[PDB]
Each structure stands twice: as C-alpha cells, then as structure tokens.
Write a protein that binds this ligand. Structure first.
Ligand SMILES: [Cl-]
Ligand SMILES: [Cl-]
Lengths: 510, 510
C-alpha cells in the first residue's frame, strides 16, 4: 500500500501508463488510471513522464489519480519520483529508458517496415480460406499496391490450440504460402494462448500441466495440487489458457510456432490476446505471478520471432516487438487518436508502433466515409509502419483511391528517412514518431496532438477533419513544405488550403 | 415430498429403476437408488416391478430405499403402487408397460440385428481416420467375419458441435462410405449434444439461443433474459450444451444429422452423452424441464433415425431405440453383468438391448484374458444384438479366434428366432431376452442371473467363469441341448462338461 503524492510544477504536463488512454492526456484534474490487472485494451507500462523532465517508475503496477494539481499514486510494490536535470520531456524519456527499459539493440523483421502491411481481417472476417486469401493478395498487386507482410487473421485453424491450417478451407496451405512468397509477400498468422477446452490439444496441455489452474477460491490450494483448468471468458467464448509463467508452456508454444514455420514456410505471428484482464480471478500459476506479468510473458514469445505484432502488452519497452495500436472504429474521433497514441507508445519504449488498420480495425464499424479512409491512410503513411485491411479498391471511388495510392508513394519517397530512424531506435530507443513536445520542448506544443515529427527534421501535419483549411503550428526555424517547395518562417501558426490529396509535411531548413 | 412405504410380501423380490444397478438386485436391505438427476451411467426409468405382480410408477424421478423388509419411495412428483392379479413378474411388467410405456409398433433398423455390429473405438481410439477405418473393415472381411453395422466412434470431426469429417484424417469421406457400403457395411457416426465453447458452432448456437443458459445461481433470472451459456464439465472437458427442451435445438440437430446423411450417405448415429447428471446446477432451459427430461428428450432424437444407439436414457420405454449397456471393463465381474443388466433393460421397456462391446468397452482396460473375450462373445451371441470392437484376430490365438467365429455361426443359425421375437417386441413390448423369473415364476429362479430365455423356448446358459464345469438350473419340463440332442428332465440342476467352444443352449420340448 505504498503511496506517493506529487504536486505538479507550474505548467507541468504528465503522460504515461497506458497507450489507449493517450487521448485523456496530459492528465487533467479528475483523471484516473488503474494498471493493476488492466492494460486498457493495448500496451501499458508503470511509467509516467513530465514536460519538466520528471518521471515516475515502479517495477510493478500502480494506480494514478490527479486531484486538483496533485498526483496520487498507489503502488502494488514500490516506486519513486525522479528528475532529469535537462528539464524536458525528452530528458525524462531518455533517463527513464536507460534506467528501466534500455534499448535491446535489435529490430523486428525489416519487411514489416519496408512495405505497407495488409491484414485479411476486414475483407474476409471469419471466412479465412485459401482462395479468398490468394485473391486478396492478387488484388493488392493488380491495383498497383506494393507487396508486403500479409497477416492471415483469426480462424485459419480448426479450433483454438490447434496450430494447423483447416484442410476444409486450405487444401494446399504450403502451396498457398509458396505462391504468396513468389508474389513478394511475407506471411504472418494470428495466434493466441487460448485452448478450446474439450479438445485433444486441451487434454494434452492439461496433462502436461501447462495451463493455468482453477484455485477454487481456496486461499491454500497450491499450483502443484490443482487439477482443474481455469476457464476464461473472452470475446470468442470460453477457453482454457496457457500459463505464461510455466517454462513448459514456452516449450509447447515454440513447438507449435516452429512447426508452422517448418511445415508451411510461415514468416511470423500476430500475437493477440494476452490482455492482463484475462488472468484475473481464481487462478493459479506455476511461478505465482500477477496478471500483468502474464501479459508481459506472452510478449516475450515475440523475442523468438523477429516478425511479430502485439496489441496487448505490459512492459517490454526497448524490445524488438511491433506494437499495434488497438482496433480503431471507423470514426473521425478514432483517426484523431492515432498520433497521440503512437507518440505515447514511443515514450513508453514502443518505438516500432503501427497505428492499427487504415479506415478502422473494428469489423462491426463495417455508410462508409471515403474521406475518412483517405485521411486514415495519409496519417499512417509517415508513421513507422502502415497497415491496410479494408480493400481501398473495393470501397473507394477513383480519386479517393488515387489519393490513397499517393499516400503510399509519399511513404516510399520518405522510406530512407523512416528506416534511418527505425534502425537508430533499435540502438538508442529514441522514437521514430516523436511528439512536438519531445523535439520542441517548452515552445507551446504540450497539447499539439495533430502534428508529429518523423525523426528530427520532418514535421508531418495530416489533415484529420473535414474542410479545405488546415492550421499548422510551426516551431521557430524555417520550414519547407516538401510538395509545394514553399519556405515558411517558423514560430507562428499558418493556414494551408487543402484538398483530398494534401498531406502537409515540412522539412526543417533552419 | 410424497412417498410410499411398502412392506415386502413373503418371498417378494423387487427390480427396477436403473439398468446399471441390476447386479445389486433384487433390492436388498440397505439398498439406495437416486434417479433424480442420475441415470447411473446408462438407462433409467421410474418403475419398480416385483416377483409377486406388484409395481410402482411415477411420471417423474424418485429415490428408492429398502430398509429391513420395507421398500420406501420418495417422489419428486406423485406415484402409486399397483398389483397385477396374475401375481408374477411377467404380469407386473405387462400391466406396467400397457399403462405407462406401451410398445410403439416400430423396430430400429433391422441391419442392427441381422448381423454383428462393429465399433472402431477399441482398435482406433481417438485416431479415427479414413485409412484405418477401411483397414478394419477389410480385416473383418478377410478374417471371415460378416459385414454389419460399423460405428465410427468419437473424434471423426474437427471439434464438438462441428458435424463434418475432419479433412486432415478423411481426404474423401463420401468415397470411404461408398466403399464401406459396397463391402456390405452400413455406417453410423458418434454424436453428442456438447459444443466446443469458443468456436464458430458455439457462437452460432448461442446466437440462436439453442444452448442451455447459466442461471448465475439467481432464483429470478428467466431463460428469456439470460445471456451466458451453461458450461458443463464432462469426461472430454468443458463444453456448452444443447437445450433439448428448445424446439430450435431439435431443428439445429436435425439440420446437422440430415446433412451428414445427404452429403456423405451416413446410415445412422450413435448418440452418446445426454446423461441427466450433465444437466444439474445453475442452468436455465427454455421450457423449464428437469435434468432427467433433458436426457429423455435427447433420446427422442433417435425416433427420427431408425438406425440409432443410446447409452444414457430416461424413460422412452417401448420405443424403437437401441439401448446399449454401458462401457464394460475387461473383467469377469463385468461379463457377469451382461445378462441381469440386459434382462432388466427389457422389463423397463428396452427390448432392443445390446450388451456393450465384446471383451469390454472401456479403452483403459486396454494381460488380455483371451478366455474372457471368448466367453464375452458367446454371451453376446444369443442376445438381441452382438457388438465387437476389439479385433478378435489381433488379440486371440487360433483356437480362441475359432471359438468366437463359432459363436457368430450359432447366432446366424438362431437368427430367425431372434428376429421373430424382435419383431414381436416392437408390437407388444415383450422382451427378446427374458429373465428366468419372467418365464418361470415362483420356481426358485429369482436370483438366477447366469441364464436367460431367448423368447419362450430357448434357455441359454453361457459359461461365465473358468473351469470345465457349468451348473444349469432347469425349470420343470423337458429340455433338449441343441448341439448334443440330449434331453434333460427339469426341476433340478444339472452339471455339464464344457470346453472353450461350449455355449449351453436348451430347447423347451415340454
Ligand atoms: Cl473480451
Ligand atoms: Cl463425465
């Protein structure tokens, strides 16, 4: 029950805790975030950072409240306030990273960056089958989009815990992968730690004792004597679940994933679920860890598979994992989350951040707003990674489609810059996508969340609402818009006339 | 709770309630049977019958106790004692059947009787696959055994509630069936009402509200407002389950079974599970029925598929369902159960009774006792139906195998008699396999359970222990041993020399 009360410095702004709460930051009066047993649908870290160079860390979960002008933090373990003497957000980030999540030196598979990614989810939903996957890949090529990583989403397998292609819908999965490889795609499969609880796989896992066990609500029952599996309710139903604390569960998962690589030529894995909330309640783990660390240990499996993607995470800052922003709705409100969510991700140690799925990642959001899809695409373009799912050729008229293609072209033109800073993030952990405050401290940018910096020298200001006018706040210095070539004096806000095709981006010239 | 308390008449013996308790009958001082929520692993009926022509019935479950010479019944509803004026077990049976379970007039598919049955369970266990099923069928024929109904047991499908062949182990299931048909087999599939609770099938059944719902332990929550499924722990794991009270569940189940017939040419179904114990607890059903009636209503599905087999049952006496004795251990104790279990089944309205599996039906009994297997086959031979699973040619040396073949041959010789009484049982409900007490009342046969009558005129006394001597208690009259032609006067016990090949059987000639 150790607690800490932190009066804000005059004008101080605080961010941290949870990627999927970044739209509620800087933390305001009234604000509350619970990290214990809750990653808020995405990545979370027991870190806060301030605009005055202050930081808070604990190795373990905490809760934070802002009441008036005071932070109140309640630690499950212990924590402390720190000050970096430089006095900026960047200093807080740099000191906290080097103490608590130093950069590993490694990158995820570069194929994840060197082309757009594509996910079968929106087009195929639960009907993941060989014919429709090949058609989607052919359509990507035929429409002039670059081959990249192709993620086959949930439901390619017979049941949860069976890591094989369902032969009814995949008559020749190895052939299919070989065709996809030929066309220039790499292939990832959706996986999770849940096991259909009346199957051969489930009975095998229970016999090996690699599942989480049911405590029966007993205060005394020990892991080694439990006999029944925990059953967990999640969005697809009711399942047994792997115990991430159990070294034998790691062996089993490796066997399954290594099998898919050897048998079918699979390049990597989209690791879904693992959310802390799934590990709450009457549950016994072999090494007696908490729900947050179950999530963290799921995340470590990716360290073995350079081509990976996670949505749920606890810690693992400074690690070679792709961290995707969670399922976004097909709304203007959600497109406006991409930048502040992604910039926060970077500060929490998640440099390799991909802003969900162009146009939305929630399949019941799919009435479609074509303009929204264009702006979504344009906003992805100069983020560290760009991910499609809904087919632009199916849902967009000809000029909207062209605009999306133009966004992809701008990404191609800027890729050497993206890769420079991506490779650097492996080494120093410094973010690829930086907030305005990170690069330009104490210059009035604390609440500017519709602009970001790609490295140090490119200011990107995606259009994220309807209208023909866009306001852009330029830091001191001179800035040259990379399309128009027009040079602007900095230290003011300019108004730009925009069309559907505009993606404002400025090179620092002073 | 309403009740009856019944002093036994002098010499009176009582049977009833539950097939799988018949070896504990006639009911002794200290006996207890609970039917409510419990079918004792097999069939159960709310009926008791006495050697003095008395009987007890209720529409609803009860519990029965014998303390001293008092038979006490505690009813969930209401019940009554009755007396048949003829004063014998046969009179009690006949009156009870005509009042409470009159014969339907119908037979199950005659192919279940006109040849031995075979079931892939013991030889293939959970590895049900096209190649091995066809090899077993070929082995049957190549060893000189007759083609019959072949039952493909659990695990032919991807997961529970997916009614399709798994293409990984069945590359051409329709072709396999067509081959089996050409070899003179008919084919049944194992089915159950459980649904893997994180699958597509589960989510469909949930959306259609055909599952049993979770009451949450609330005494007010109605079916109509419940949102979560009941999860049931059973021998294979944890599953959602069909609500047999829900007419929509009947439609769903018909769609699945009809589809298997139409698409692959499946002749019938082995309906497993449905045991009343699975329906206990915090459960809401659409028509607010009890656990026993959930078992009964599963049973009624077989009224639509003349080629059927059930193990779990409540009521449905007098109906065209094959009723299989439950999984028997590979023990002498269990072989000695086949006759009393089968004879009781008959008196409870289950004329069409098959005595589980030759040599045993419990896969973890599988030091095989060859003699036991032979005697098991010989005991099956003149029962209504005969069912193999373990491969006699694999586990028996040449003499023993030959003895099993001779048992099949005797069954073929006797088949016209079997079918005569089977056909009659559809009309009158009178059993095919009759207890000695039933045919010869008040003659000292009350506890003779190693002999039975095939209809009126054939007394069968299978050898059911080791040794070269068999004692046979003959009713008054004259009795002709069918092999030897020797005529024995009745009203006494004879001793017969026997070999491994002997199946003592006597024709009534007075
Ligand atoms: Cl969920
Ligand atoms: Cl069970």
């Amino acid at each position: 029950q150790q607690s800490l009360h932190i009066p804000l410095l005059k004008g101080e702004c605080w961010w941290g805790a949870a990627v999927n709460r970044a739209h509620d930051m800087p933390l305001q009066p009234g604000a509350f975030i619970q990290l214990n047993g809750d990653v808020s649908g995405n990545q979370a870290v027991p870190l806060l950072l301030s605009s005055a160079g202050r930081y808070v860390w604990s190795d373990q979960p905490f809760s934070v409240k802002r009441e008036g002008d005071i932070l109140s933090i309640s630690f499950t373990g212990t924590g402390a306030l720190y000050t970096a003497s430089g006095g900026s957000l960047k200093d807080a980030w740099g000191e906290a990273a080097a103490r608590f999540f130093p950069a590993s030196g490694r990158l995820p598979d570069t194929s994840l960056f060197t082309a757009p990614q594509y996910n079968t989810w929106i087009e195929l939903i639960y009907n993941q089958n060989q014919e429709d996957i090949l058609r989607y890949a052919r359509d990507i090529v035929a429409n002039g989009f670059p081959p990249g990583v192709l993620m086959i989403d949930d439901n390619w397998f017979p049941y949860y815990g069976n890591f094989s292609f369902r032969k009814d819908r995949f008559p020749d999965a190895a052939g299919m992968i070989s065709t996809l490889h030929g066309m220039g795609f790499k292939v990832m499969l959706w996986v999770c730690p849940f096991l259909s609880p009346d199957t051969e796989a489930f009975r095998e896992a229970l016999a090996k004792r690699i599942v989480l066990f049911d405590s029966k609500g007993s205060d005394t029952l020990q892991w080694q004597h439990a006999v029944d599996p925990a059953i967990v309710h999640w969005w697809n139903g009711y399942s047994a679940v792997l115990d991430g604390s159990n070294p034998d569960a790691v062996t089993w998962m490796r066997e399954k994933l290594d099998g898919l690589q050897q048998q079918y030529g699979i390049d990597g894995f989209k690791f879904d679920a693992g959310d802390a909330e799934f590990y709450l309640g009457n549950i016994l783990s072999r090494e007696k860890i908490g729900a947050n660390e179950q999530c963290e240990r799921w995340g470590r499996i990716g360290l073995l598979y350079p081509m990976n993607e996670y949505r749920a995470m606890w810690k693992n800052g400074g690690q070679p994992l792709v961290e995707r922003l969670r399922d976004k709705y097909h709304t203007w409100e959600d497109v406006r989350k991409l930048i502040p969510h992604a910039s926060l991700a970077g500060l929490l140690g998640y440099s390799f951040v991909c802003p969900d799925m162009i146009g939305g990642g929630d399949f019941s959001s799919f009435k479609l707003d074509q303009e929204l899809i264009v702006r979504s695409a344009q906003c992805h373009a100069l983020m560290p990674m760009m991910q499609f799912s809904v087919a632009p050729w199916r849902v967009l008229d000809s000029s909207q489609l062209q605009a999306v293609k133009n966004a992809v072209a701008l990404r191609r033109q800027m890729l050497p810059e993206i890769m420079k800073y991506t490779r650097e993030a492996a080494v120093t952990g410094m973010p690829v996508l930086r907030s305005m405050e990170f690069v330009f401290p104490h210059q009035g940018f604390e609440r500017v969340e519709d602009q970001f910096m790609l490295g140090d020298n490119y200011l990107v200001a995606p259009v994220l609402e309807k209208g023909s006018v866009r306001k852009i706040k330029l830091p001191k210095g001179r800035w040259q818009e990379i399309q128009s070539g027009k040079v602007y004096r900095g230290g003011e806000t300019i108004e730009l006339k925009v069309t559907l095709n505009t993606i404002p981006c400025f090179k620092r010239t002073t």
